């Protein structure tokens, strides 16, 4: 019967929650209170990247930690030389309402997608000189919200449809599709071993997926509204969430609990972009009150406020080297921030 | 300073010249967003305008009196309008289309309009209503078989407002219902609206050719009122 089926479901959920809370003697706060809190970190804008006509929704550093790519509502991708603020390429898009972008690890490709349910792959190292589209991925049914290359021939997408898919650019098929969510999947992040990834799906629930097998290996439920951002710790055994309830939370793929709740009564609007630092000690989060509040991963406080934008920040990424950090906002400006000593 | 300073200058400033060339085009075209239900003319209206000037957005562009408009019909999307309506702020106006023939599928149409109007990211976006399928309403309520008061009992003690504009050769016993369904939406709009954005109802039926002109005039009014509120005179 349906009622009995829902019964066992409920008791399985209870067996999930009690087992999860069984192994929860301590919190990061207890183990980090004795640890020395980090000082008040103070970044400063070291150069500004003017040129976008309208709002900015995405950015992503290259693997050289010097090139950059960013997406805008006017429908352009711009590749900056972040050292000299030079412009390398200006790629006009077919659809203006792009919502994400990604830069291939080899540096040969960039990807972008948006409200049109298409993921576009661009070729940067063309023998003919210009930048051309190399592939279109049209299997999705909802709007596309994030893209992440695995290599030159494998990309993973997350759409407004309650689905994540694994593509292969050579053929354009949908080798593996990931289902189980119930809301719009918003963010995405690859583990630093190219074997698992996570996705927040507008239902306060995040999941861990297996790029090879295909089934949802693990699911977390600790928020209370739409989950807007997600990112792996540099370890590969953790990930932080940012949601519309103005709270960030840190999970762990082998603990099945949220660890720290990143709350502040002064902060009232929801998170929009989350990224970590190379050491994993500085959790940087974009917000909607026009600042990029910088939190400490372990000590659960605010050790820095990167407020230099006029409109709402929307994207936030760090270099693979770790020497800088960039922020894009709805003011059409992209600022690379760095410290000074 | 090196001979490879062409990348430093003679490439980046050519790109910048192209970008500032495109900026003039961008900040000269008004973007419009079209919303509606499945049983309405939101497909017919857009194609009719297009005729004479698993995909996602169905782009549509047209101009009236040397002013360019980019209307974005949103296509194959899920039922929720929650998290992709944020991208459509700072457009000139939202074009909401309602079916008037149905009455069963009207209460949730008002609910959807209320949801759009009270959205947090659209508090500065004026809405343009097209109470479409009105020829069907005219030919239907004349052969009276479904009573409006069954779904809306307040229609009973309703009086046609003095500022009515009935078309020539029109039964006055359709106009009360017309303005009833209109001012239901209007009273939903006025409540909790502090002048930053207004509601602009219109009466199109199926094939009114003067829809581009209506959108043009409404956009002019929207811009004029926005400035007159900035230029504190209104």
């Amino acid at each position, epitope marked *: 019967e349906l009622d009995q089926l829902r019964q066992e479901a409920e008791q399985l959920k209870n067996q999930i929650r009690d087992a999860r809370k069984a192994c929860a003697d301590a919190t990061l706060s207890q183990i980090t209170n004795n640890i020395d809190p980090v000082g008040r970190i103070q970044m400063r804008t070291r150069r500004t990247l003017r040129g976008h006509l309208a709002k900015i929704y995405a950015m992503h550093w290259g693997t050289d930690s*010097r090139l950059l790519v960013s997406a805008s509502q006017d429908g352009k991708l711009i590749i900056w030389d972040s050292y000299t603020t*030079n412009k390398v390429h200006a790629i006009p898009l077919r659809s203006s309402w792009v919502m994400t972008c990604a830069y291939a690890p080899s540096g040969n490709y960039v990807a972008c997608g948006g409200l049109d349910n298409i993921c576009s792959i661009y070729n940067l190292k063309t*023998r003919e000189g210009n930048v051309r589209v190399s592939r279109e991925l049209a299997g999705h049914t909802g709007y596309l919200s994030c893209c992440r290359f695995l290599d030159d021939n494998q990309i993973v997408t997350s759409s407004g449809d309650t689905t994540c898919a694994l593509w292969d650019i050579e053929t354009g098929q949908q080798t593996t599709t990931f289902t189980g969510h119930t809301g719009d999947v918003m963010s995405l992040s690859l583990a630093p071993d190219t074997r698992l990834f996570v996705s927040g799906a507008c239902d306060a629930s995040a999941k861990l997926w297996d790029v090879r097998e295909g089934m949802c290996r693990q699911t977390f439920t600790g928020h209370e509204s739409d989950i807007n951002a997600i990112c792996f710790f540099p370890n590969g055994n953790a990930f932080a969430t940012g949601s519309d309830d103005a709270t960030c939370r840190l999970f762990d793929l082998r603990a099945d609990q949220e660890l720290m709740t990143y709350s502040h009564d002064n902060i009232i609007c929801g998170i929009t972009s989350v990224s970590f630092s190379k050491s994993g000690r500085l959790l940087l989060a974009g917000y909607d009150d026009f600042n990029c509040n910088v939190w400490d991963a372990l000590k659960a406080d605010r050790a820095g406020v990167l407020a230099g934008h006029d409109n709402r920040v929307s994207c936030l990424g760090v270099t693979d080297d770790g020497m800088a950090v960039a922020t894009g906002s709805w003011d059409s400006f992209l600022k690379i921030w760095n410290g000074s000593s | *300073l*090196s*001979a490879e300073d*062409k990348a430093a200058v*003679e490439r980046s400033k*050519m790109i910048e010249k192209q970008l500032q060339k495109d900026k003039q085009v961008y900040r000269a075209t008004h973007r419009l967003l079209l919303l509606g239900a499945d049983n309405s003319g939101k497909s017919t209206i857009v194609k009719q305008m297009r005729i004479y000037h698993t995909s996602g957005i169905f782009e549509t562009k047209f101009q009236v009196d040397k002013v360019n408009f980019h209307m974005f019909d949103v296509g194959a999307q899920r039922d929720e309008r929650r998290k992709w309506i944020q991208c459509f702020n700072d457009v000139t106006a939202i074009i909401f289309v309602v079916d008037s023939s149905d009455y069963n599928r009207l209460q949730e149409a008002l609910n959807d309009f209320k949801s759009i109007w009270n959205n947090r990211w659209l508090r500065t976006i004026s809405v343009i209503l097209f109470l479409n399928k009105q020829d069907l309403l005219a030919e239907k309520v004349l052969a009276g078989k479904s009573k409006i008061e069954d779904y809306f009992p307040e229609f009973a003690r309703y009086t046609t407002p003095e500022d009515a504009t009935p078309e020539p050769g029109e039964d006055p016993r359709v106009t009360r219902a017309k303005y009833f369904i209109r001012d239901e939406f209007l009273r939903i709009s006025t409540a909790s609206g502090d002048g930053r954005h207004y509601c602009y109802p219109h009466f199109t039926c199926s094939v009114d050719t003067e829809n581009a002109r209506r959108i043009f005039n409404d956009c002019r009014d929207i811009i004029q009122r926005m400035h007159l509120r900035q230029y504190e005179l209104l």
Partner: single-chain antibody
Amino acid sequence: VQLVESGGGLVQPGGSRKLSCSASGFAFSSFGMHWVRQAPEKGLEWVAYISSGSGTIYYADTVKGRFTISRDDPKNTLFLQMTSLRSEDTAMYYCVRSIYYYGSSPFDFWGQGTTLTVSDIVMTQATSSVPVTPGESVSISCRSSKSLLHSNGNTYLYWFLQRPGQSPQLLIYRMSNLASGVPDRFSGSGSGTAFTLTISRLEAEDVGVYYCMQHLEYPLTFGAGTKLEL
């Protein structure tokens, strides 16, 4: 990607000619354009340069007055106007594309070049000829005058191989970066004033003459050349 030249031929001294480069198969308007000449048995010598958008134009100090360069993007053709040909202008003029951005490979593609007959940094290539057989390794030397290593980190030394009956072809740009269609046998190195090119295993398609270019300033000079024989 294909450049073909025209406008060459015998010239009575005191006349003038209008050399042209006709590009095809690439975004010509995004590429800078050079001209390089070569005496019938000497090394190469830079001629002129015009940038993308015609904003920047240089010339060789030898003939900076008589010559004049010009491009025309819509027809994807490049022009060289030259007047009052001196006695020494007998050479094999080449047309070279070069796009400059972070990570690009300037001088990557060389045209087939045209012929003509009329009736301060320098590099010295120590060796003139090296006998060789297939199989072993070869290191070709080339020294300079100033230090090519710039502050930003680049070095601006180039390595083009020209086969006995073919056009020059880039091997290693900026002293360490290998080109697109070149096998990974080749490798470059050097001090910063004296440089060397290294080849692991020779084949039948590695003989010819090797040339080393500097690009630190505008007069991109050449070495005399090293020619390998079997």
